[PDB]
Write a protein that binds this ligand. Structure first.
Ligand SMILES: NC(=O)c1ccc[n+]([C@@H]2O[C@H](COP(=O)([O-])OP(=O)(O)OC[C@H]3O[C@@H](n4cnc5c(N)ncnc54)[C@H](OP(=O)(O)O)[C@@H]3O)[C@@H](O)[C@H]2O)c1
Ligand SMILES: Nc1nc(=O)c2nc(CNc3ccc(C(=O)N[C@@H](CCC(=O)O)C(=O)O)cc3)cnc2[nH]1
Length: 159
């Protein structure tokens, strides 16, 4: 099973040239909880902004170019990224935009965080059709002293 995890602002914005203008540690705890002990597949731009290997996960980085950090696994295509995951119950694709686009048609589950923030971004989560997906879990949270904006966690499973 392939899943995608992402945090989207309005208009499905997931990235901009500069750091996102929000602080959502609860969302990062959710990302950690849902990715721990699973392989995570990411694109090279996302690798760079994470800055280190994610602990307790097998880190697979897609890049057309030779790898530059022997602590993680580098692959040059989607089929190779999947093959590097081995025989696991769930592969987590953690972005970014170009990677989500390529894995969305393969995915059976989406873990999405919807952030009540309007930002201009250069990178979007792909268009998905609500009717293709069944919302199996959703949990809204208000902003609070640690989290700058309200946000809602949702898990969708492919119909
Ligand atoms: N809010 C969120 O949930 C979230 C999640 C993840 C990322 N992001 C954000 O999204 C942005 C990054 O998105 P992006 O679309 O720019 O970058 P990305 O998808 O992270 O990385 C793209 C790079 O990955 C490699 N790649 C992708 N598909 C490949 C394939 N089939 N074969 C070989 N290499 C492949 C290429 O690396 P080479 O260039 O080395 O060939 C390509 O330049 C940032 O702003 C980041 O912080 C947000
Ligand atoms: N829901 C969601 N929110 C995100 O911010 C997000 N970010 C990415 C890509 N970027 C990142 C950036 C940093 C970390 C990170 O540092 N995570 C740590 C800290 C978790 C915590 O603070 O509790 C980790 O161990 O997962 C992960 C992914 C992919 N999917 C996401 N999904």
């Amino acid at each position: 099973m392939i899943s995608l995890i992402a945090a989207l602002a309005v208009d499905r914005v997931i990235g901009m040239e500069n750091a996102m203008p929000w602080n959502l540690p609860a969302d990062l705890a959710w990302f950690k909880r849902n990715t721990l002990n699973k392989p995570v597949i990411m694109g090279r731009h996302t690798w760079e902004s994470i800055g280190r290997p994610l602990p307790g996960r097998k880190n697979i980085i897609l890049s057309s170019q030779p790898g530059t950090d022997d602590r993680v696994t580098w692959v040059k295509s989607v089929d190779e990224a999947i093959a590097a995951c081995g025989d696991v119950p769930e592969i987590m694709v953690i972005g970014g935009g170009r990677v989500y686009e390529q894995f969305l048609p393969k995915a059976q589950k989406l873990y999405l965080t919807h952030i009540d923030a309007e930002v201009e971004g250069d990178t979007h989560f792909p268009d998905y059709e609500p009717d293709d997906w069944e919302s199996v879990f959703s949990e809204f949270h208000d902003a609070d002293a640690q989290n700058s904006h309200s946000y809602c966690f949702e898990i969708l499973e492919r119909r």
